[PDB]
């Protein structure tokens, strides 16, 4: 159908430039302009302007002329929106919208500005653990950065009884944990894994719950 | 710059009930072509934003005949016909009748459902995060409404403040509880200095507090 798809999340330092790619199938691109939306983290949206598929003239708020460029290819179906000389304040989820009265949004682009590095997490198996009716295991997933993990149990098998907290920052990195409630007529002889993904830097692991 | 005013800020509804947000523009708000062009979006924690009503009332295909809209002038109200939890998210108002266009800040839909107690579980270290020279104690207060709860740590029967992490998950799909992770950081060298971890919780649901702890010699 109809959908707008942008480019993944991003790492960027102080200072840098970011190029994000909004890309719309489904109608013909160069009836609809398409707006661009920021919603810094917290609450609030905020409107960035907008830029005239057909002639690419584009249209800056205020509050965003100077440092912010928007383009496109047509030749392509993509807008671009680039950010110049980036500020920590410029972290926030990006999103391209179509229509001057808006209808349809893209997924959202998140950009973290920081000078915190790229880092793996470490996955410790949080047991009881070893020795009723009811276990509850976990999984804590330390010192990551940047936003987000993947944690599934299992591989996606189990998805009853499972919370997953919201990461928070731990001084300059994130931490994430995620606590599964089974039978305990089911571990340790079912085996319980908790399957960490970190796509920033590429890490995989599978941790094995065993009984303490 | 119209600046739009939503109310109330987070509202609170049982499932079958109705809801009621409030818009309110600080001028109005009909374009230079004599629309209006006020729009409702639902955004849930998950995702990007999803069009409900466009032109103050005009329902967007595949939005249920549940959610209607209506106003003039500077007022403007979205009506929630009969709540579902598949309704749970963030409601905002906008309008694209003079430049910027302006967003309300949103108003937050909570289910109101019957209190729970927290279940509560603790967990040691575990033996790999002790050998990098660290030890979180990890306390997870699983299924309890209301969203208020307190949580204290004891070491050796003493309150410890410092180096306790909280998260709280937002609303449950199914059953409309929240959950809730507190975790004690400390070294493995003054972790190794005391025997007793205790996770105390005080929630509504009870006037003495559930704790759970373990000592480190006991099993
Ligand atoms: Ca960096
Ligand atoms: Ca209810």
């Known amino acids: 159908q109809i959908q707008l798809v942008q480019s993944g999340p991003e790492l960027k330092k102080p200072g840098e430039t970011v190029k994000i790619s909004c890309k719309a199938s489904?109608?013909?691109?160069?009836?609809?302009?398409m707006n661009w939306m920021k919603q810094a983290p917290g609450k609030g949206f905020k409107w960035m302007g907008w830029?005239?598929?057909?002639?690419?003239?584009?249209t800056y708020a205020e509050d965003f002329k100077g440092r912010f460029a928007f383009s496109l290819e047509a030749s392509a179906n993509t807008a671009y929106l680039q950010i110049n000389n980036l500020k920590n304040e410029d972290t926030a989820t990006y999103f391209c919208?179509?229509?001057?009265?808006?209808?349809?949004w893209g997924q959202g682009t998140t950009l973290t500005v920081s000078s915190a590095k790229t880092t793996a997490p470490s996955v410790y198996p949080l047991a009881p653990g070893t020795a009723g009716s009811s276990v509850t295991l976990g999984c804590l997933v330390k010192g990551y950065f940047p936003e987000p993990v993947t944690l599934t149990w299992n591989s996606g098998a189990l998805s009853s009884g499972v919370h997953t907290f919201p990461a928070v920052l731990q001084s300059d990195l994130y931490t994430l944990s995620s606590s599964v409630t089974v039978t305990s007529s089911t571990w340790p002889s079912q085996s319980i894994t908790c399957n960490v993904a970190h796509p920033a830097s590429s890490t995989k692991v599978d941790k094995k719950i065993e009984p303490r | 710059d119209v600046l739009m005013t939503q109310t109330p800020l987070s509202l609170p509804v049982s499932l079958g009930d109705q809801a009621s947000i409030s818009c309110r523009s600080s001028?109005?708000?009909?374009?230079?072509?004599?629309?209006?062009?006020l729009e409702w979006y639902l955004q849930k924690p998950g995702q990007s934003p999803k069009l409900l009503i466009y032109?103050?009332?005009n329902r967007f295909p595949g939005v249920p005949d549940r959610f209607s809209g209506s106003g003039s002038g500077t007022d403007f109200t979205l009506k929630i016909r009969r709540v579902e939890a598949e309704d749970l998210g963030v409601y905002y108002c906008?309008?694209?009748?003079?430049?910027?266009?302006?967003f309300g800040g949103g108003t937050k839909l909570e289910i109101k459902r019957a209190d729970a107690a927290p279940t509560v579980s603790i967990f040691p270290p575990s033996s790999e995060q002790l050998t990098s020279g660290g030890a979180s104690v990890v306390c997870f207060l699983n299924n309890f409404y209301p969203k208020d709860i307190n949580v204290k740590w004891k070491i050796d029967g003493s309150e410890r403040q410092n180096g306790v992490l909280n998260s709280w998950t937002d609303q449950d799909s199914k059953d409309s509880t929240y959950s809730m992770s507190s975790t004690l950081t400390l070294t493995k060298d003054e972790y190794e200095r005391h025997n007793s971890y205790t996770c105390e919780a005080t929630h509504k649901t009870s006037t003495s507090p559930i704790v759970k702890s373990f000592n480190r010699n006991e099993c």
């Open positions: 001028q109005t708000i009909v374009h230079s072509n004599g629309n209006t062009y």
């Open positions: 919208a179509r229509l001057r009265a808006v209808d349809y």
């Open positions: 032109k103050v009332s």
């Open positions: 906008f309008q694209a009748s003079h430049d910027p266009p302006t």
């Open positions: 489904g109608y013909t691109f160069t009836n609809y302009g």
């Open positions: 830029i005239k598929t057909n002639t690419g003239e584009p």
